[PDB]
């Protein structure tokens, strides 16, 4: 099947699974959030084991 | 390979119909009705295989009481005189048909008195 390109631009593969992603809440209304909030959300992240199946076969 | 599949239906319907023999109306000719009739018949057989082992025991007790009321004493008293004194695990259907052999049950009747 064709892999949806709308998602191939929002996920990155890593060795032994562990899909990589970026956190949201970074492009709007900075003053409403603390500087500590932006300090945390600047880092990358990974998805939980819950949505792993819906991402695996889709990518 | 196109499959016709004719033998299975005939043999199944014949086997189901043969089970319900001596049935009123068309219930012994229509397979669709015969299967339901045999379903219900076997369910009744299942429940009756316990209902009869209970009803026979009921008639068992009744016919013991019939004989024991003639001696002027109570059936429960007879079971008592079996159990606590003069310990006897004697069969009930035994003592029932020992009415048929005459006066031989009376030996057990007189034996409970120590």
């Amino acid at each position: 099947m064709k892999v949806k390109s709308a998602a191939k631009k929002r996920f990155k593969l890593t060795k032994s699974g562990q899909i990589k992603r970026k956190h949201a809440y970074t492009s709007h209304l900075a003053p409403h959030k603390t500087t500590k909030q932006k300090r945390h959300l600047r880092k990358q992240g990974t998805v939980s084991a819950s949505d792993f199946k819906r991402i695996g076969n889709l990518i | 390979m196109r499959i016709k599949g004719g033998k299975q239906t005939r043999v199944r319907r014949k086997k189901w119909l043969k089970q319900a023999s001596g049935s009123f109306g068309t219930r012994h000719a229509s397979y669709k009705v015969a299967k339901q009739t045999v379903i219900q018949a076997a369910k009744y057989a299942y429940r009756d295989r316990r209902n009869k082992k209970r009803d026979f025991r009921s008639l068992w007790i009744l016919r013991l009481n019939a004989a024991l009321r003639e001696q002027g004493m109570t059936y429960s008293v007879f079971i008592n005189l079996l159990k606590k004194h003069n310990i006897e695990i004697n069969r009930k259907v035994l003592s029932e048909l020992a009415i048929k052999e005459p006066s031989k049950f009376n030996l057990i009747v007189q034996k409970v008195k120590s």
């Binding site: 949806k4 709308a6 998602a7 631009k9 929002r10 996920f11 990155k12 992603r21 970026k22 956190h23 949201a24 970074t26 492009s27 949505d51 819906r54 991402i55 076969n57 889709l58 | -």
Partner: protein
């Protein structure tokens, strides 16, 4: 074997059927639903859909494409933890093609990588080497003639 006693060991597993038997173990609605949406024809809507809630592949931000419309420059890697097993010296492009390490006709720079120690002296001819990899190569009396 003979054509009358062919035998398997563990293949020929169970064959589920979605439309045979009321009480075969699999019912009339086997696998799909009990009159739910998935039970119906062409059920199991598209995998990315999540019920009406905004999809996960849209709630997340979008990654970057720093180099727009290009492919990453590919390299052929020679890790020093595996070259030692391959029995050959003077490892050079005139000699890789013989050992089937690389494709016969292929133009590509060669990268040298590794930290694990090596014993037998070697003579690499590559385009680039890691600094500590080069140090490790030169520790064991080896020599690397770094090409252009």
């Amino acid at each position: 074997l003979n054509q009358l006693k062919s035998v398997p060991k563990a293949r020929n597993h169970k064959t589920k059927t979605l439309g045979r038997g009321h009480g075969s173990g699999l019912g009339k609605t086997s696998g799909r639903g009990q009159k739910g949406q998935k039970a119906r024809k062409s059920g199991l809507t598209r995998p990315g859909f999540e019920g009406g809630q905004t999809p996960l592949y849209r709630r997340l931000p979008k990654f970057g494409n720093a180099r727009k419309g290009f492919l990453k420059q590919e390299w052929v890697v020679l890790n020093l933890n595996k070259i030692a097993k391959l029995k050959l010296d003077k490892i050079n492009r005139a000699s890789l093609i013989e050992k089937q390490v690389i494709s016969a006709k292929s133009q590509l720079p060669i990268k040298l990588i590794g930290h694990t120690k090596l014993e037998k002296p070697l003579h690499f001819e590559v385009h680039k080497v890691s600094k500590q990899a080069l140090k490790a190569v030169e520790n064991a009396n080896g020599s690397v003639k770094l090409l252009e």
